[PDB]
Amino acid sequence: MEIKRFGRIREVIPLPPLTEIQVESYRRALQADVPPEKRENVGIQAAFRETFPIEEEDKGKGGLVLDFLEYRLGEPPFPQDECREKDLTYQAPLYARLQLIHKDTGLIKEDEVFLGHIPLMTEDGSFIINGADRVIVSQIHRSPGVYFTPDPARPGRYIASIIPLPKRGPWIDLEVEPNGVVSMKVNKRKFPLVLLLRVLGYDQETLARELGAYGELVQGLMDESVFAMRPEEALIRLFTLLRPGDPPKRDKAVAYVYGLIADPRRYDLGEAGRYKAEEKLGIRLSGRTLARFEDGEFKDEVFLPTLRYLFALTAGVPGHEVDDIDHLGNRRIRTVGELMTDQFRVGLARLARGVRERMLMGSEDSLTPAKLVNSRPLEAAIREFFSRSQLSQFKDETNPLSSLRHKRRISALGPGGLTRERAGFDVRDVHRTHYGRICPVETPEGANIGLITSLAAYARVDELGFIRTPYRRVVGGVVTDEVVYMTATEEDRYTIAQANTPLEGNRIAAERVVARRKGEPVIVSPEEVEFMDVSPKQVFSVNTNLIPFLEHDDANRALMGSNMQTQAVPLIRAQAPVVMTGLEERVVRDSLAALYAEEDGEVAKVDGNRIVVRYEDGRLVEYPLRRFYRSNQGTALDQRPRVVVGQRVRKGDLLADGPASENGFLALGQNVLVAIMPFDGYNFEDAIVISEELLKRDFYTSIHIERYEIEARDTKLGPERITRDIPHLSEAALRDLDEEGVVRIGAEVKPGDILVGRTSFKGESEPTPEERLLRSIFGEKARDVKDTSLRVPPGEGGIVVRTVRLRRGDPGVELKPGVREVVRVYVAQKRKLQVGDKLANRHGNKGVVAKILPVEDMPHLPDGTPVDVILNPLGVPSRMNLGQILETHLGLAGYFLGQRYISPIFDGAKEPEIKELLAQAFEVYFGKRKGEGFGVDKREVEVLRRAEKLGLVTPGKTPEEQLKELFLQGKVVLYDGRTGEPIEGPIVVGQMFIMKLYHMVEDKMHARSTGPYSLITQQPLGGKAQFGGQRFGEMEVWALEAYGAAHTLQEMLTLKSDDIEGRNAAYEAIIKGEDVPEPSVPESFRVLVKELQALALDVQTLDEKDNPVDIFEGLASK
């Protein structure tokens, strides 16, 4: 299986480690491996230092000075798998170091306080929370900076805006009124900005001349000079305009917060907020926000340049200073680390809220730790984040790729409340900046469009929540092997060129060059080229980047394909596509699917269970294998070993294959032999037909493991117990249970079988007065006990593979209150490809398997080789996805050559390469035929007739050469299986990669007769051996109503659910062989009479002539 690779653009730098977003976000979050000595703070340590100097001074007695030194974690409670087996979180313990001082002598320092537990991250990038693997998405929002907006309402001029956040961080808006009045909005407050400038220290003289020289608009500033004659008098003047009945003397009081400390700051000193100000305007920014503590009289870092630029924009050209919202340099991405640290900060301040109150009830000296510290608020906060937050979710780990794509997903809809389901128009739209930064394809179908979108393959978040796509500098017309990851805003400064631009080492070729100055598509010259694209993968996500002939595919069905790959199911006979993009290897690599040698070496031992190697440095290492493990959405993820005893190996070489990996290539489905023709109505509107042969050679067959669980809760009536001797059960039903009442391993279990025997006592509680005595009187413990066991639900199981008991004397387990033990039984099934299943190619051909033909009567080549699958051609013209056709063609050639290929995305394989390879193949599919003893079939001739008459072959030629022609065009003769006559027209066939999706027909087919019914509302449900009924919706009612279906509708609203007396009459009467007892009165009606009567309404029923009518069945009488 030799790989030819097509197209050579030398993609100069490899992909980022595609998990880096989570791993490094949660590295930067918690400086954990590094000493607290280490100089950078941001994340946990900064969230610490932010709150930490806790000054509760003088309202009676104080001198509390509790400060921060160090913090540490080190030791996780339990192993990872231990954290999953028992339902525990994978965490480290947090204890920071502290010293509270006094107004008097000395300072007690209690080293450690394990205030709160803090989860950890796995190598691969996920978390373990409730026992359950979870993942934190990222988030988008408006980056905290200085922005300039056209006046929404008024058509003319602009309004500034100073945006901070964390939420606590005040919002200021600086608009200039044609009236001249420079208005200024905080908390809905509108006033001449000047009052504020004065508070800073700006006198009306230096202001107008040195700022507003260039605009005459400066005269809109200086109007109220009457008030602006007095400095600190202004601070009070302003103090007025918040009016709770304040102390008008309290000087630096509100101005303290919007100066320095708690409110507008960005994370840390240097680049946190300063970049967004520094770039859009201004020059520098000492301090986090405009502030002063050392002199008391205040300095604005900010307020002058902001207004200066509102001038600079209102009048003429510094550059062109209107700011775009959706531009991804004026929008920001929230890594995991930061999100968790935001919650960690608000938790820490819940603690700082309680401890102030402990500064009051505190004795005098006796305070050192637990007086001040409880884990409770911080713990509750972090825990609340990880297990209840909108942005944590169950790991999408159907297959490796799925989980990977989840890890690098990106959401708009913030649990902080960033965006809501109502609005979406311009929000959802792709924006110029999403180039190289965000996938234009990866957004999902239906409501969630453009809100959740995954980031580009090459994109990577820098120190501050900004996406940065690379580019390579080019020098005059000389291209560099040097690469710069550029900011969105920074990107627009330059003239960037396309990667599909011709080369000669470092040199452009074409005088006409394709290139993009900010946004626009521009034709340009070689000299003018400042930067060039790295490769065309950078434009799209990872999924989207695994489609090989994407170039020829409408983005709409390309999205379908990208998303489809998410839901592929890992197949026992998994295969890596005959034709790949090349990323498959790196994807199984970066996902932690497989197992790779760490050094050169040799192999020592190879179990199904583990592998042991002997390295160069002297080491010998055991790697155990994930033998057969269950995944969040059912799919089996075992690792298989691929190496032998006494085989040498190379660093980075693979040792065992992941869930859906084939010799270390992403294997999501198979390569089947497709013919692409219509069939006797069996591949209709998208349906798909199959050769039974796929089942005999276990192809589209996948394992699946469900997992059942039951508790032995403890009761008012007495404790429940897990045992074999249930009462009213036939010996037959008990055969497969072990002595403890748990079903034994490797037994075949049918819906209705017992998995776990459990016996509860008779309910209605322990009747002390008479029975208590009876207990003494008669064989104490001779009471009564009913059976409440665990049955395989309708739906099914298969065979028991694994049991887990979590018993009392709980040896490392957090059992719920009341819970005595729990039992889980794991049940697997091999799921062959039944009819009703879903299959789809990479190019987005959703289809159902609709017919399984026996090998015998389905379309076969001249040589008796039949096709495996039969796709309707009618699926192609609508859904412009000619990629799959080119897959099929290349596949055809790869079948006879016995080789696989890599067509890089936009550096594809071109038409004639294809053709040459096909020629190569014809001399194998046919060259043999002639020597073997066999020329043409009379059928072959008879179809070549119609072929040249149709214009496919060129008349006058030998059938050999005609068949060559017909081959190269993608098509070959095909015989009907069932007639043996040929198909009157040649037909394209080839190898197609096609996969089996999560949507099998187990989760899907229900059918209710009769059963349970809910207690308040009497519409049915299910439990023991009964499904639940389908909802008959209002529209379904409308449907019936349009028709005359009066009775059918009544039934649907009566006998078939709700009306009890009626439905019972109905069943019994069916058993008789009677029609059905519809009438009497409807439930709803008598119930709405009495329910109406419960408020004092007299609702009475009348005859034709207005007369009384007893609706209540002769039961109304007193």
What is the smallest separation between the CB atom of 817 and another protein, expressed in angstroms?
Answer: 10
What is the smallest separation between the CB atom of 936 and another protein, expressed in angstroms?
Answer: 21
> Among residue numbers 706 through 745, which ones bind another protein (CB under 8 A)?
713, 715-717, 745
In angstroms, the CA 159 to CA 148 distance is: 6
Instruction: Identify which range of 137-145, 365-373, 927-935, 967-975 contacts another protein by CB under 8 A.
Output: 967-975
What is the smallest separation between the CB atom of 880 and another protein, expressed in angstroms?
Answer: 5
Which one of residues 553, 585, 662, 693 is an interface residue with another protein (CB under 8 A)? Answer: 553
In the bound state with another protein, the residue whose beta carbon lies nearer, of 329 and 798, is 798
> Among residue numbers 661 through 690, which ones bind another protein (CB under 8 A)?
676-678, 680-687
Q: With 0-12 CB in 10 A as exposed, 13-18 as middle and 19+ as buried, what is 1038?
A: exposed
Q: Which two tokens stand for residue 916?
A: 């040459």
In the bound state with another protein, the residue whose beta carbon lies nearer, of 168 and 830, is 830
Strand partners, 992: 672
What is the smallest separation between the CB atom of 264 and another protein, expressed in angstroms?
Answer: 32
Helix extents (H) in 398-519: 400-407, 425-428, 488-492
Which one of residues 136, 346, 559, 580 is an interface residue with another protein (CB under 8 A)? Answer: 559
Per-residue string for binding with another protein, 15-44, x by CB under 8 A? Answer: ------------------------------
Pairing mode, if any, of strands 91-93 and 117-119?
Answer: antiparallel
Which one of residues 987, 992, 994, 995 is an interface residue with another protein (CB under 8 A)? Answer: 987
Number of chain positions touching another protein (CB under 8 A): 214
In the bound state with another protein, the residue whose beta carbon lies nearer, of 288 and 838, is 838
Q: Does residue number 874 form part of the binding site for another protein (CB under 8 A)? A: yes
Per-residue string for binding with another protein, 483-502, x by CB under 8 A? Answer: ---------------xxx--
Which one of residues 848, 893, 953, 973 is an interface residue with another protein (CB under 8 A)? Answer: 848
Strand partners, 819: 713
Instruction: Identify which range of 35-43, 94-102, 148-156, 533-541 contacts another protein by CB under 8 A.
Output: 533-541
In the bound state with another protein, the residue whose beta carbon lies nearer, of 588 and 603, is 603
Alpha-carbon Rg of the chain, whole angstroms? 37
Which one of residues 153, 317, 361, 1005 is an interface residue with another protein (CB under 8 A)? Answer: 1005
Which one of residues 49, 201, 969, 977 is an interface residue with another protein (CB under 8 A)? Answer: 969
Q: Does residue number 457 form part of the binding site for another protein (CB under 8 A)? A: no
What is the smallest separation between the CB atom of 328 and another protein, expressed in angstroms?
Answer: 14
Is residue 471 within 8 A of residue 483, CB to CB? The reply is yes
What is the smallest separation between the CB atom of 892 and another protein, expressed in angstroms?
Answer: 10
Produce one character per residue of 283-314: b if its CB has 16 or more CB atoms within 10 Å, e if not.
eebebbbbbbeeeeebbbbbbbbbbbbbbbbe
Which one of residues 450, 548, 570, 577 is an interface residue with another protein (CB under 8 A)? Answer: 450
In the bound state with another protein, the residue whose beta carbon lies nearer, of 910 and 930, is 910
Instruction: Identify which range of 109-117, 207-215, 291-299, 1047-1055 contacts another protein by CB under 8 A.
Output: 1047-1055
Q: Does residue number 572 form part of the binding site for another protein (CB under 8 A)? A: yes
- Neighbouring residues of 750: CB distance < 8 A, sequence distance ≥ 6: 792, 796, 797
Is residue 948 within 8 A of residue 955, CB to CB? The reply is yes
Is residue 544 within 8 A of residue 550, CB to CB? The reply is yes
Is residue 706 within 8 A of residue 639, CB to CB? The reply is no
In the bound state with another protein, the residue whose beta carbon lies nearer, of 75 and 421, is 421
Q: Does residue number 804 form part of the binding site for another protein (CB under 8 A)? A: no
Q: Is 788 helix (H, G, I), strand (E, B) or coil?
A: coil
Q: Does residue number 1013 form part of the binding site for another protein (CB under 8 A)? A: yes
> Among residue numbers 878 through 907, which ones bind another protein (CB under 8 A)?
878, 880, 882, 885-886, 889, 906
In the bound state with another protein, the residue whose beta carbon lies nearer, of 281 and 451, is 451
CA dist list (Å): 541 to 240, 438, 454, 801: 55, 7, 6, 38
Q: Does residue number 612 form part of the binding site for another protein (CB under 8 A)? A: no
In angstroms, the CA 91 to CA 78 distance is: 8
Q: Is 755 helix (H, G, I), strand (E, B) or coil?
A: strand
Which one of residues 150, 270, 316, 763 is an interface residue with another protein (CB under 8 A)? Answer: 763
Q: Is 965 helix (H, G, I), strand (E, B) or coil?
A: helix
Q: Does residue number 773 form part of the binding site for another protein (CB under 8 A)? A: yes
Q: Does residue number 1048 form part of the binding site for another protein (CB under 8 A)? A: yes
Distance of CA 287 to the CA centre of its chain: 38
In the bound state with another protein, the residue whose beta carbon lies nearer, of 198 and 383, is 383
In the bound state with another protein, the residue whose beta carbon lies nearer, of 100 and 578, is 578
In the bound state with another protein, the residue whose beta carbon lies nearer, of 478 and 1046, is 1046
The residue numbers preceding gaps of C to N over 2.5 A in the chain are none
Q: Does residue number 551 form part of the binding site for another protein (CB under 8 A)? A: yes
> Among residue numbers 335 through 364, which ones bind another protein (CB under 8 A)?
none
Q: Does residue number 447 form part of the binding site for another protein (CB under 8 A)? A: yes
Q: Does residue number 9 form part of the binding site for another protein (CB under 8 A)? A: no
- Report the Cα–Cα distance between both ends of the chain, in Å, rounded: 90
In angstroms, the CA 272 to CA 7 distance is: 43
What is the smallest separation between the CB atom of 1059 and another protein, expressed in angstroms?
Answer: 7
- Neighbouring residues of 997: CB distance < 8 A, sequence distance ≥ 6: 564, 567, 568, 569, 837, 838, 839, 840
What is the smallest separation between the CB atom of 593 and another protein, expressed in angstroms?
Answer: 17
What is the smallest separation between the CB atom of 987 and another protein, expressed in angstroms?
Answer: 5
Instruction: Please provide the size of the chain in residues.
Output: 1118
> Among residue numbers 853 through 872, which ones bind another protein (CB under 8 A)?
872
Instruction: Using alpha carbons, select from 350, 383, 395 the residue that is nearest to residue 118.
Output: 383
In the bound state with another protein, the residue whose beta carbon lies nearer, of 481 and 1113, is 1113
Is residue 603 within 8 A of residue 644, CB to CB? The reply is yes
Q: Which two tokens stand for residue 760?
A: 């509860």
In angstroms, the CA 441 to CA 369 distance is: 54
In angstroms, the CA 174 to CA 183 distance is: 6
Is residue 111 within 8 A of residue 97, CB to CB? The reply is yes
In the bound state with another protein, the residue whose beta carbon lies nearer, of 226 and 1042, is 1042
Q: Does residue number 765 form part of the binding site for another protein (CB under 8 A)? A: yes
Distance of CA 987 to the CA centre of its chain: 41
Residue 166: is the preceding peptide bond cis (ω within 30°)?
A: yes
In the bound state with another protein, the residue whose beta carbon lies nearer, of 96 and 391, is 391
What is the smallest separation between the CB atom of 877 and another protein, expressed in angstroms?
Answer: 5
For the chain, how long is the longest CA-to-CA vector?
112
Q: DSSP for 310-365, please give it.
A: HHHHHSS-SS-----SSSTTSSEE--HHHHHHHHHHHHHHHHHHHHHHHHHH--SS
Q: Does residue number 264 form part of the binding site for another protein (CB under 8 A)? A: no
